Design a protein around this motif. Structure first.
Motif, PDB file in Angstrom:
ATOM      1  N   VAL A 241      18.144  -7.263  25.942  1.00  0.00           N
ATOM      2  CA  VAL A 241      18.992  -5.928  26.307  1.00  0.00           C
ATOM      3  C   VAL A 241      18.670  -4.951  25.183  1.00  0.00           C
ATOM      4  CG1 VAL A 241      21.418  -5.110  26.135  1.00  0.00           C
ATOM      5  CG2 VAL A 241      21.054  -7.411  26.825  1.00  0.00           C
ATOM      6  N   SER A 242      18.114  -3.734  25.844  1.00  0.00           N
ATOM      7  CA  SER A 242      17.531  -2.801  25.082  1.00  0.00           C
ATOM      8  C   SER A 242      17.618  -1.514  25.453  1.00  0.00           C
ATOM      9  CB  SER A 242      16.125  -2.990  24.792  1.00  0.00           C
ATOM     10  OG  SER A 242      15.126  -2.880  26.057  1.00  0.00           O
ATOM     11  N   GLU A 243      17.882  -0.486  24.200  1.00  0.00           N
ATOM     12  CA  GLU A 243      17.930   0.914  24.581  1.00  0.00           C
ATOM     13  C   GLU A 243      19.338   1.198  25.660  1.00  0.00           C
ATOM     14  OE1 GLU A 243      14.112   2.653  26.140  1.00  0.00           O
ATOM     15  OE2 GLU A 243      13.410   0.737  25.402  1.00  0.00           O
ATOM     16  N   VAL A 244      20.425   0.579  24.983  1.00  0.00           N
ATOM     17  CA  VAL A 244      21.701   0.890  25.786  1.00  0.00           C
ATOM     18  C   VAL A 244      22.476   1.857  25.057  1.00  0.00           C
ATOM     19  CG1 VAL A 244      23.816  -0.166  25.972  1.00  0.00           C
ATOM     20  CG2 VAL A 244      21.991  -1.515  26.756  1.00  0.00           C
ATOM     21  N   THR A 245      23.031   2.711  25.539  1.00  0.00           N
ATOM     22  CA  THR A 245      23.816   3.984  24.885  1.00  0.00           C
ATOM     23  C   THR A 245      25.293   3.750  25.520  1.00  0.00           C
ATOM     24  OG1 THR A 245      21.928   5.296  24.295  1.00  0.00           O
ATOM     25  CG2 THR A 245      24.097   6.390  24.264  1.00  0.00           C
ATOM     26  N   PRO A 279      18.087 -11.101  22.604  1.00  0.00           N
ATOM     27  CA  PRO A 279      18.133  -9.892  21.762  1.00  0.00           C
ATOM     28  C   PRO A 279      18.862  -8.579  22.201  1.00  0.00           C
ATOM     29  CG  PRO A 279      15.988 -10.438  22.169  1.00  0.00           C
ATOM     30  CD  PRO A 279      16.637 -11.637  22.768  1.00  0.00           C
ATOM     31  N   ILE A 280      19.592  -8.165  21.495  1.00  0.00           N
ATOM     32  CA  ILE A 280      20.203  -6.791  21.710  1.00  0.00           C
ATOM     33  C   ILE A 280      19.597  -5.581  20.730  1.00  0.00           C
ATOM     34  CG2 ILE A 280      22.439  -5.340  22.025  1.00  0.00           C
ATOM     35  CD1 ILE A 280      23.802  -8.266  22.273  1.00  0.00           C
ATOM     36  N   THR A 281      18.622  -4.873  20.926  1.00  0.00           N
ATOM     37  CA  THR A 281      18.183  -3.953  20.323  1.00  0.00           C
ATOM     38  C   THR A 281      18.133  -2.679  20.640  1.00  0.00           C
ATOM     39  OG1 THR A 281      16.039  -4.190  21.357  1.00  0.00           O
ATOM     40  CG2 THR A 281      16.342  -5.783  19.601  1.00  0.00           C
ATOM     41  N   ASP A 282      18.222  -1.714  19.797  1.00  0.00           N
ATOM     42  CA  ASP A 282      18.208  -0.086  20.299  1.00  0.00           C
ATOM     43  C   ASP A 282      19.564   0.179  20.856  1.00  0.00           C
ATOM     44  OD1 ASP A 282      15.842   0.985  18.793  1.00  0.00           O
ATOM     45  OD2 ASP A 282      14.688  -0.024  20.252  1.00  0.00           O
ATOM     46  N   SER A 305      21.377 -15.097  15.215  1.00  0.00           N
ATOM     47  CA  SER A 305      20.581 -15.015  13.881  1.00  0.00           C
ATOM     48  C   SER A 305      19.320 -14.154  14.363  1.00  0.00           C
ATOM     49  CB  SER A 305      20.243 -16.325  13.560  1.00  0.00           C
ATOM     50  OG  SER A 305      21.410 -17.024  12.973  1.00  0.00           O
ATOM     51  N   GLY A 306      19.079 -12.953  14.149  1.00  0.00           N
ATOM     52  CA  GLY A 306      18.161 -12.232  14.153  1.00  0.00           C
ATOM     53  C   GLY A 306      18.123 -11.590  15.538  1.00  0.00           C
ATOM     54  N   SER A 307      19.159 -11.702  16.404  1.00  0.00           N
ATOM     55  CA  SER A 307      19.179 -11.274  17.781  1.00  0.00           C
ATOM     56  C   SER A 307      20.006 -10.002  17.964  1.00  0.00           C
ATOM     57  CB  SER A 307      19.699 -12.335  18.977  1.00  0.00           C
ATOM     58  OG  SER A 307      20.815 -12.802  18.433  1.00  0.00           O
ATOM     59  N   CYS A 308      20.325  -9.243  16.998  1.00  0.00           N
ATOM     60  CA  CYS A 308      20.779  -7.785  16.963  1.00  0.00           C
ATOM     61  C   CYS A 308      20.238  -7.197  15.891  1.00  0.00           C
ATOM     62  CB  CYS A 308      22.397  -7.970  16.856  1.00  0.00           C
ATOM     63  SG  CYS A 308      23.198  -8.987  18.156  1.00  0.00           S
TER      64      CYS A 308
END
Length: 336
Positions: A241-245, A279-282, A305-308
Motif C-alpha cells: 500500500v503506497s501513496e495513499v492520501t 508495507p504501508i508507505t507514503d 515491524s518495519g512495515s509502516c
C-alpha cells in the motif's frame, strides 16, 4: 439505433444492435443477471423507473455491464431496488442465506456511471474491476438494513482497477463505504458515508492482486459508522500500500475507531498481532478531523515491524472517546 426494453430477455438479445438502450421498469428473473456485458463501444444505457429482481438464494451479480466508452445513466427518479430484506438475516456473506452481489463493472473501461440509485442491496453493491471508469452522483440507500438485518452491504469494492473516480456518492449502509482491495490511481471525492464501516483501504492481501498505489480519498464526510478512516492489511499476507492520501475528511458519531490502521486484519476478527508483509508507505493524512462516540477509540495504529514508514500527518484531530493503549510500531511524525 435507439431501443427501449421492458423485459430482460429482449434487452439481452438486442443489446449489441442498439447504440442507446433504455431499460424501463424491468423485472429481472430470479437467479439471473441483467446481463449488459459485451456492449458495442459508444453505447449509452439508461435506467428508467424501478428495476426489480426475483428472489433466489444465489451469488449474483444482479446486474453486470461491460464494454468500452459506455455511458450508463439513471434517469431522474429511477431506482434499482434489490428488496434485500428478502435475504437479510444479519449474516451477510458470512453465513445464512446465499445472497447475490448487486452490480458488476468488470472491464467497463473508459466509461461512466452517473445518477444510479441502488435501494436495499442484498449484500455488496458495486464490484469495480475496470480502467478509466467514473461513478458520479451514485446513491446507495440501504438504510432499511440498519434495522432489518443488513450486513456486508459495501457500496464500492475496488480491485484490479486503474483510474477510478467516484464523485459525490451518498451511501447509507452497514459495511465499507469504499473498500480498495487493489488498484492504482483511485479518487473518491465529495462523498457522504453513513451507517457503515468507513472509508477503507483494504483489506489488502490474500488475493491475486494485493497492490494499492496512488489513492486519494478527499472532501468527504463519515457519520454514524464503525470507523472513519481505515487501512486494513491481512494478517500474514503479502502486498503493498503506497501513496495513499486522506485529505479533508470530517467524521462524527464514530463508534469503534476514528482512524484505524491495522496489519492484523482477518474477516472474522483481527488477530491482535500485526505482520509485516504488506508495507504501508507514503501515507498522508491532511485535515482529518471530527469526533467519536464515548465508547470509541480516537486513533489506533497496529503496524508490523518495519512495515509502516514515510508517513505525513498534519491537522489530524479526533475528539471524544478514549486514547488507545494498544498502538504498535507507530512511524515517525505520527501519534495515536
Amino acid at each position: 439505433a435507439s431501443c427501449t426494453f421492458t423485459d430482460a430477455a429482449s434487452a439481452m438479445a438486442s443489446k449489441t444492435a442498439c447504440s442507446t438502450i433504455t431499460l424501463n421498469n424491468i423485472a429481472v428473473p430470479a437467479g439471473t443477471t441483467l446481463d449488459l456485458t459485451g456492449l458495442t463501444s459508444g453505447t449509452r444505457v439508461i435506467f428508467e423507473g424501478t428495476t426489480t429482481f426475483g428472489y433466489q438464494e444465489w451469488s449474483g451479480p444482479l446486474v453486470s455491464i461491460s464494454g468500452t466508452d459506455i455511458t450508463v445513466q439513471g434517469a431522474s427518479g429511477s431506482v434499482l431496488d434489490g428488496d434485500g430484506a428478502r435475504w437479510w438475516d444479519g449474516q451477510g456473506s458470512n453465513g445464512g442465506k446465499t445472497k447475490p452481489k448487486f452490480f458488476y463493472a468488470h472491464s467497463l473501461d473508459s466509461s461512466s456511471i452517473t445518477g444510479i440509485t441502488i435501494k436495499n442491496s442484498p449484500v455488496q453493491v458495486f464490484s469495480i474491476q475496470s480502467n478509466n471508469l467514473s461513478l458520479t452522483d451514485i446513491t446507495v440507500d440501504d438504510a432499511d438494513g440498519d434495522t432489518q438485518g443488513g450486513h456486508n452491504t459495501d457500496a464500492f469494492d475496488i480491485g484490479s482497477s486503474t483510474y477510478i473516480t467516484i464523485t459525490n456518492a451518498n451511501v447509507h449502509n452497514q459495511d465499507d463505504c469504499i473498500a480498495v482491495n487493489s488498484g492504482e490511481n483511485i479518487i473518491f471525492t465529495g462523498g457522504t458515508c453513513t451507517g457503515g464501516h468507513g472509508l477503507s483501504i483494504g483489506s489488502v492481501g490474500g488475493r491475486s492482486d494485493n497492490t494499492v498505489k496512488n489513492v486519494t480519498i478527499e472532501h468527504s464526510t463519515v457519520t454514524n459508522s464503525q470507523n472513519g478512516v481505515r487501512i486494513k492489511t491481512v494478517y500474514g499476507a503479502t502486498g503493498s500500500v503506497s501513496e495513499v492520501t486522506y485529505s479533508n475528511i470530517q467524521m462524527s458519531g464514530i463508534t469503534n475507531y476514528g482512524i484505524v490502521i491495522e496489519q492484523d486484519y482477518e474477516n472474522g476478527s483481527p488477530t491482535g498481532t500485526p505482520t509485516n508483509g504488506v508495507p504501508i508507505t507514503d501515507l498522508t493524512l491532511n485535515c482529518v478531523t471530527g469526533s467519536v462516540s464515548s465508547g470509541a477509540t480516537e486513533i489506533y495504529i497496529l503496524c508490523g515491524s518495519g512495515s509502516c514508514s514515510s508517513w505525513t500527518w498534519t491537522c489530524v484531530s479526533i475528539t471524544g472517546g478514549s486514547k488507545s493503549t494498544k498502538c504498535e510500531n507507530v512511524p515517525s511524525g505520527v501519534s495515536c
